[PDB]
Design a binder for this molecule. Structure first.
Ligand SMILES: [Zn+2]
Lengths: 215, 78, 298, 74, 135, 281
């Protein structure tokens, strides 16, 4: 319905009315069709509904595990936690791989190939850059293949998930560093209001001296 | 402008302009374009089958009131 | 009021227009009240003019002891700096404009000469000194409104001079500025022939409070553009032309001070320091952006 | 009559074409008609060819803007 | 980037003189498709070798670099090479280029979120406006 | 209130800032002529850069009162442009500014009036008689679509900046301050940065509220902040590191030569006065 970065736009009121009316096993079908929603793998205001709250910790408590994985966890979590979460499709298993990998490139300028080969259990170049190119092909990834650094060049990242909340701490760390660079640059500003304002005064007075030298 | 000459397009558009008896047709071009949007560099000023130098005075070619400063000029301006 | 000077009293303005104080003293006009239309298309049409010299009619008025430039700008033309009375040919512009400008209450009339020497000024050269002198004996109050486009590019300040040239018979009195300026070979001789036949007007600027608020708010989102210049890449070649020109000027300062254009060595030291300052401040802004955005470490 | 009129016209035509660049196709040919009202009745078509003749000599070029409405060159 | 029997059905769309095909056996449209294919790969990618990109394209690395040099025997190619190291290269566009890339990248990203919330919080738009007038 | 909520056009022109001042100046002109804040018209032009609009240059016009409506005296404006298109050919009539409250059917009407010289023109609204803290410029543009069986145009707003001309910027810096030239330079930096600073600070404020309380919990808030913190210092790369060694070494040896220029001019004057008093120059 609404439109910015998100999965298939049906999903919002789609799963609103689904969890509203589909519950238990109908809630499981709800979840199964939730599973393919990439840009919203996390449902903060969609788990706002008590229907998803019973989705969570109901029969599908493992699915709330998976949802928080999207919010918090990674696919390599599943590589360890192969049984904790609900089932996933190979497409969706690679989707959780893309979870952790978009989070990684979110971290670094460019994540190494071997990094995701190992954490995401990726064996070889072929499948590696297959899922890589499909991630970039989602257009989440700008930049290019950082082969020489054995990385992936990254110029732009679309938001992966809703990623339940460091939100407060996130925005306040943002406020912190914003103000920090601001104050660095503002100390510069007033050093400028010193120096070549001092340059104005200095040369003005020096020229006064030179003019008074005559008579 | 003391000299009130005519700048004429290929179709005969003779324009009344105030210039001087030493007024540069270099700036007479400026005048024709500042007056008619038709810019002067395809307002090729030709005098009697032979071009008028874009860098000259109108009166250099004994140009006067009913004299003609050729455009060949453009249509989109007009 | 801040709008008290934007008031174009066509009564008062055209009154002092017909006042002819210059025929009593050709040094009456000491001020030049300007609205920023001069700066507007003077600047961006000397720059958009590339290197093509231009000419025409300025909007304006007169106030007290003040010429007033409501307008000055360029053409998409050439030939100025060498035309026999260039400017005239663009007056057709406000041969029409001002006329039905009165239809909107722009009851102003024509006052001056818009122009630009793209890259090397806005003035009247040797043949245009014929222009300037003849026309000030033709058209006084007349001005040599002088600002250089590429000088105002690598300079950061608008050296505006309203140069009412000293008419034939009227010599520079106590106040003749006569802004000496480095001229190409075409007109430097005739500038030496006529460098001291003009004075400058005290060119002030007038506006509204809305004008100031608009410029501040301009900056208030242009600062992002400020940190996105990349102009060291822009005219590094311009710096190179200055390289050659400066080694040349030191050659000529050499040739002057050899045995015996005044003291080309000192003038050359001056201009060298100047242009180096120019390139250095360009590098300043660029290193500014660089160190800022490149010292942002995660 | 046909060869001497054609020669007289080539010169009158190039000279116009240098003076003002019309230059259009259609309007141009019409204006050409206007200049030589006295001479004789020309072909409305061949208007095309007319400009064509001047296109070759490096006298006037063909602009991008229209099949008509070209530009003057040289 | 679609593959062989992903559109071998397009064989049915083709024409007999066209379904009569080329010397190397990649038909006229096949290699056309490879121009198309690799062009996608090309416009995409930074730098790759030819055992890499040939196994990618299921084809000889010989052919890969070979007909690369042919792909520029068109002159529709842009990039550069090492024959010996057997590599082609993306470019990192690195600099001032990438600088303003993500400069105005963040500009649009920030203004996207700004006006998203200004429309989701036009009331809070007014409130933030109030506090910023205080600012 | 017949407006139509649409999309972009064909804007790109060049700018100088006193024509913004001539937005001011037409309002002052018609106001002094009528003794009242006059809802005026003015010939908007601007930059069009990809998907960005920049509504910049618009001076005095003719705004007649047709019984309630602002009116571009259309053929009057035709006269006017031919009165300046001779020499102002570097600028094209993008739209019209005015002065009043929000956009009204008279503003819609003269915007349509601007929609008759071209197909998709722009709309600007200024007012010194309105009551905002922002730079008073509203900017509208057009789609053509089908709704409720009616085929209609569509006019909606997009955001701008202002010109980037060198001497223009210098004049902006002065006429803002009107007194130190990079100071007269960096204050354009300061102004734009403070403007977007208010922007992303309002962002910061309603953001902080999100995590605080009573303000909507969305997952698309900070998330972008994560993107930002991975947008940190671009090009660590050593590429630009060498590049900037290059740049600063160039300018610095330039300055070194200028240590040359300065002290050599000093030296020549010294040799002069040495040839002045020690010698017969
Ligand atoms: Zn002259």
């Amino acid at each position: 319905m609404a439109g910015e970065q998100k999965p298939s736009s049906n999903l919002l009121e789609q799963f609103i009315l689904l969890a509203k009316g589909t519950s238990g096993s109908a809630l499981t079908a709800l979840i199964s069709q939730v599973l393919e929603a990439p840009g919203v793998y996390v449902f903060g205001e969609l788990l706002e509904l008590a229907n998803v709250q019973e989705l969570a910790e109901g029969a599908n408590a493992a699915y709330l595990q998976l949802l928080n994985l999207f919010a918090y966890g990674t696919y390599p979590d599943y590589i360890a936690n192969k049984e904790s979460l609900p089932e996933l499709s190979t497409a969706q298993q690679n989707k959780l791989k893309h979870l952790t990998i978009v989070s990684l490139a979110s971290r670094m300028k460019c994540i190494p190939y071997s990094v995701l080969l190992k954490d995401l259990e990726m064996r070889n170049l072929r499948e590696l850059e297959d899922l890589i190119i499909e991630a970039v092909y989602t257009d989440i990834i700008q930049g290019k293949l950082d082969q020489r650094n054995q990385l992936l060049e990254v110029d732009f990242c679309i938001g992966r998930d809703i990623r339940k909340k460091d939100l407060s701490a996130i925005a306040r760390t943002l406020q912190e560093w914003c103000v920090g660079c601001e104050v660095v640059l503002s100390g510069i500003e007033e050093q400028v209001s010193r120096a070549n304002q001092h340059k104005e005064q200095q040369l003005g007075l020096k020229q006064q001296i030179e003019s008074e030298v005559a008579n | 402008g003391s000299m009130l000459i005519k700048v004429k397009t290929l179709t005969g558009k003779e324009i009344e302009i105030d210039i001087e008896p030493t007024d540069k047709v270099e700036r007479i071009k400026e005048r024709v374009e500042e007056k008619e949007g038709i810019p002067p560099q395809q307002q090729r000023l030709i005098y009697s089958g032979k071009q008028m130098n874009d860098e000259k005075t109108a009166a250099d070619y004994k140009i006067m009131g009913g004299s003609v400063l050729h455009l060949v000029l453009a249509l989109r301006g007009g | 009021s801040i709008d008290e000077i934007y008031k174009y009293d066509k009564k008062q303005q055209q009154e002092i227009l017909a006042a002819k104080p210059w025929t009593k003293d050709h040094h009456y006009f000491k001020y030049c009240k300007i609205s920023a239309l001069a700066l507007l298309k003077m600047v961006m049409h000397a720059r958009s003019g590339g290197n093509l010299e231009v000419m025409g009619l300025m909007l304006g008025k007169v106030d007290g002891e003040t010429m007033i430039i409501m307008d000055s700008f360029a053409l998409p033309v050439e030939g100025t700096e060498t035309r026999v009375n260039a400017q005239a040919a663009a007056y057709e512009y406000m041969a029409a404009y001002i006329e039905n400008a009165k239809q909107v209450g722009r009851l102003e009339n024509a006052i001056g000469w818009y122009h630009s020497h793209p890259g090397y000024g806005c003035w009247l050269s040797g043949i245009d000194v014929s222009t300037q002198m003849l026309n000030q004996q033709f058209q006084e109050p007349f001005v040599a409104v002088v600002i250089d486009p590429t000088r105002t590019i690598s300079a950061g300040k608008v050296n505006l001079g309203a140069f009412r040239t000293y008419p034939k018979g009227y010599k520079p009195p106590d106040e003749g500025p006569s802004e000496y300026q480095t001229i190409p070979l075409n007109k430097i001789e005739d500038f030496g022939v006529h460098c001291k036949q003009y004075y400058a007007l005290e060119v002030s600027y007038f506006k509204s409070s809305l004008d100031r608020k608009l410029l501040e708010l301009l900056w208030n989102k242009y600062w992002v553009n400020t940190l996105s210049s990349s102009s060291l890449l822009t005219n590094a070649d311009y710096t190179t032309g200055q390289v050659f020109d400066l080694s040349e000027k030191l050659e000529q300062s050499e040739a002057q001070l050899g045995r015996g254009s005044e003291d080309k060595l000192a003038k050359a030291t001056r201009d060298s320091c100047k242009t180096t300052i120019e390139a250095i401040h360009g590098l300043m802004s660029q290193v500014i952006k660089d160190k800022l955005f490149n010292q942002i470490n995660i | 009559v046909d060869e001497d009129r054609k020669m007289y016209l080539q010169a009158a035509i190039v000279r116009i074409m240098k003076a003002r660049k019309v230059l259009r196709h259609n309007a141009l040919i019409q204006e050409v008609i206007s200049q030589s009202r006295a001479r004789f009745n020309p072909s409305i078509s061949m208007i095309k060819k007319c400009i064509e003749v001047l296109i070759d000599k490096q006298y006037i070029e063909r602009s991008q803007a229209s099949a008509d409405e070209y530009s003057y060159v040289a | 980037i679609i593959r062989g029997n992903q559109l071998q059905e397009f064989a049915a769309m083709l024409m007999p003189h066209q379904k009569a095909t080329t010397a190397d056996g990649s038909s006229i449209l096949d290699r056309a498709v490879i121009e198309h294919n690799l062009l996608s790969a090309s416009k995409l990618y930074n730098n790759i070798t030819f055992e890499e990109l040939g196994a990618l394209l299921e084809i000889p690395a010989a052919k890969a670099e070979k007909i690369a040099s042919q792909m520029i025997t068109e002159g529709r190619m842009n990039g550069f090479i090492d024959q010996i190291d057997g590599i082609v290269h993306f470019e990192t566009r690195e600099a001032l280029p990438t600088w303003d890339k993500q400069i105005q990248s963040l500009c649009f990203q920030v203004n996207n979120l700004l006006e998203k919330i200004s429309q989701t919080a036009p009331e809070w738009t007014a409130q933030a406006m109030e506090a910023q007038m205080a600012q | 209130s017949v407006m139509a909520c649409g999309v972009t056009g064909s804007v790109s022109v060049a700018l100088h800032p006193l024509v913004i001042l001539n937005i001011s100046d037409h309002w002052i002109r018609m106001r002094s002529q009528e003794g009242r804040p006059v809802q005026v018209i003015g010939a908007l032009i601007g930059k069009q850069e990809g998907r960005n609009i920049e509504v910049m240059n618009s001076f005095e016009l003719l705004s007649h009162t047709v019984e309630e409506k602002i009116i571009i005296d259309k053929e009057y404006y035709y006269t006017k442009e031919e009165q300046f298109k001779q020499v102002f050919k570097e600028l094209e009539f993008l739209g019209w500014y005015t002065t009043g409250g929000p956009p009204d059917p008279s503003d819609i009407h003269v915007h349509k009036q601007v929609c008759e010289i071209i197909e998709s023109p722009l709309f600007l609204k200024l007012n010194p008689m309105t009551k905002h803290t922002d730079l008073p410029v509203s900017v509208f543009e057009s789609v053509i679509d089908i709704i409720n069986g009616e085929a209609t145009m569509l006019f909606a707003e997009l955001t701008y900046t202002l010109a980037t001309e060198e001497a223009e910027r210098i004049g902006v810096d002065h006429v803002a301050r009107m007194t130190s030239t990079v100071a007269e330079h960096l204050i354009a930096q300061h102004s734009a940065i403070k403007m977007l600073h208010s922007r992303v600070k309002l962002i910061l404020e309603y953001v902080k509220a999100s995590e605080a309380g009573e303000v909507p919990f969305n997952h698309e808030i900070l998330r972008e902040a994560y993107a930002l913190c991975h947008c940190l210092p671009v090009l660590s790369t050593d590429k630009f590191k060498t590049d900037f060694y290059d740049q600063c070494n160039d300018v610095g040896l330039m300055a070194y030569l200028g240590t040359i220029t300065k002290t050599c001019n000093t030296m020549n004057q010294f040799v002069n006065k040495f040839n002045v008093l020690y010698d017969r120059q």
